[PDB]
Paper text:
Ribonucleotide reductase (RNR) is a key enzyme in all domains of life, utilizing radical chemistry for the synthesis of deoxyribonucleotides by substitution of the 2′ OH-group of a ribose 5′phosphate with a hydrogen. The strictly aerobic class I RNRs are comprised of two homodimeric subunits: a large catalytic subunit R1, where ribonucleotide reduction takes place, and a small radical-generating subunit R2. R2a proteins utilize an oxygen-activated di-ferrous metal site to generate a stable FeIII/FeIII-tyrosyl radical (Y·) cofactor, whereas R2b proteins generate a MnIII/MnIII-Y·. R2c proteins generate a MnIV/FeIII cofactor and the recently discovered class R2d—a MnIV/MnIII cofactor. These dimetal centers reside in a ferritin-like scaffold, and are coordinated by two histidine residues and four carboxylate ligands.
In addition, we have introduced an R2lox-like L61G mutation in the second coordination sphere in close proximity to the N-terminal metal binding site (site 1) and investigated its effect on the structure and protein metallation. The structure of the metal-free L61G variant closely resembles the WT BaR2b. The structure of the putative superoxide passage to the metal in site 2 was not affected by the mutation. The substitution of Leu61 with Gly allows the Phe165 side chain, located on αE, to adopt an alternative conformation, occupying the vacant space, creating a larger hydrophobic cavity around the metal center. Interestingly, the distorted part of the αE (residue stretch 159–168), adopting a π/310-helical conformation in all L61G structures, has an increased B-factor for the Cα atoms, suggesting that the mutation has a destabilizing effect in this region. Additionally, the mutation renders a larger surface-connected cavity between helices αB (residues 46–76) and αD (residues 125–140), gated by Met1 and Glu127. Overall, in all structures reported in this study, the first 288 residues could be traced in the electron density, leaving the last 34 C-terminal residues disordered. The electron density is well-defined, except for a flexible poly-glutamate loop region E275–E278.
Author numbering:
A (entry chain B), B (entry chain A): 1 to 275, 279 to 288
Write the structure that this text describes.
Amino acid sequence: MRAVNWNKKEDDFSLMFWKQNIAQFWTEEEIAVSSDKNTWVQLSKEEQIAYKRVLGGLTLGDTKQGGEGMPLVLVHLENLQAKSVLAFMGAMEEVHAKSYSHIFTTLATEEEIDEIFDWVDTHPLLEKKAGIITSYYRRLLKPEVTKKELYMAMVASVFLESYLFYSGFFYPLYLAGQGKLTASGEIINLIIRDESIHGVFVGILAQQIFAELSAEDQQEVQKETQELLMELYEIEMAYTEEIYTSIGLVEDVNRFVRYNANKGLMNLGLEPKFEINPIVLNGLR
Amino acid sequence: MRAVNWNKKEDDFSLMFWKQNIAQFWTEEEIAVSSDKNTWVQLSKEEQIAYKRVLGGLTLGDTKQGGEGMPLVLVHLENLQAKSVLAFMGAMEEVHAKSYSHIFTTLATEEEIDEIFDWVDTHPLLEKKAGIITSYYRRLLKPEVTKKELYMAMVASVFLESYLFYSGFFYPLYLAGQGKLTASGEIINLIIRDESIHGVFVGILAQQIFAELSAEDQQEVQKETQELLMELYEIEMAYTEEIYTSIGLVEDVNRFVRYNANKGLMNLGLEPKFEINPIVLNGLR
């Protein structure tokens, strides 16, 4: 039974991604958020509610990626070096999820925080899309999986970390781009910095497994991937309308979602399927 | 579907163990090993061979813990804060496994390293020990598991990290306690510092599950736990004889194994079943 041996490369990219993930390591204790209170209070009730809701949805995303996605993808990988990288990525997803609670602690009372997480747990659209994603992971709860099943779980992973998250990243970035909630915005930028390389790395692994499939299996998962993309897209447009109508940002967020959908497709080596907001861009600075 | 909420504790210990794991974070680049060459060359061939073999055995252990044990235990947990800690621990197991390659890089040529890893992969006792432990993990590759199955996977985990590893930790510690290979010994001490709190944490989780089992189930897993303990012990006594007879350390290591078996049992809230070498103690200093 094989032990991991980093003195003999199993691929051409796991070492560089390992090094980069470690280089980018951070924890929430490093960013004090209390100074955000001064711009928090300038927001309206509806703006504050949108902010808490999208952070709640992001926390659900990281909870599923660290606790289900990365574990079940990595456990079936034969590349032990790539396995190491995914394990580190899953731990950093839990750092991300914890960093959202660090923001909440400064911005909300204990009762308001419990409102958030109860709204997350009972929200029908969050349940629907998190459930579509994790169904691909739960398919891996067996001793032997097919490469079709492992590939599609990787697709699901890229679509969550490169694509579905950005309906939520939009608003912290938009506010930070206007000088509001900028310390929380630095936390979100750290998270995004990790998520970007997570999506690139899983996409590379996916392309490698795709190339190992029979022609029939490739045709099947190419079609499934495009169906999944648009199933999630349809759900995400209902999500953005529910979250952002109150604050007049529905169509701006949708443009951001399509932009990042294109990046997730490219992370998978696939062509774009849709045609950055300058305030958001300023929040990424 | 629930997101992790750290502003409402799910238990009385996950936050403390989260903070400590993070506080203890390290990676191999922090410890240069080149200065160990000056005591490496003073060891005999038999001593150099034992050292390479036990580090190879240790790497296999961490490879299976980070890539199988932690993912398959954590994924079935209902406690999302505990899930977070385990994901971080599995990541640190991969840091540990990689640190062993960093030592090898200073001490062995590229060809000698590949010999090590081939000896690990084909070695019958290592295959047997890892095979027994991971069989408890692979039982968790299904959608629904029993608490007996999850409990015995946690037992397997404690027995590996608190107990089976120490037939290997003995020798780097014994040499470091004498001023030999002290930089590698510092790496081994950081690994042990992580492993100790790993076994404690998983042991706490096992005791929580144990208290939920029916009395009949409790007695069944107590019997399995005692049998597994002694089955592994019998294999380790053959392993120490194989590794350490050439260098006269067999009975010293056996005593170290019994000492750490007792610690693993205690991590599980169980009574000791066996009755530290002072140089090993100085290597831990």
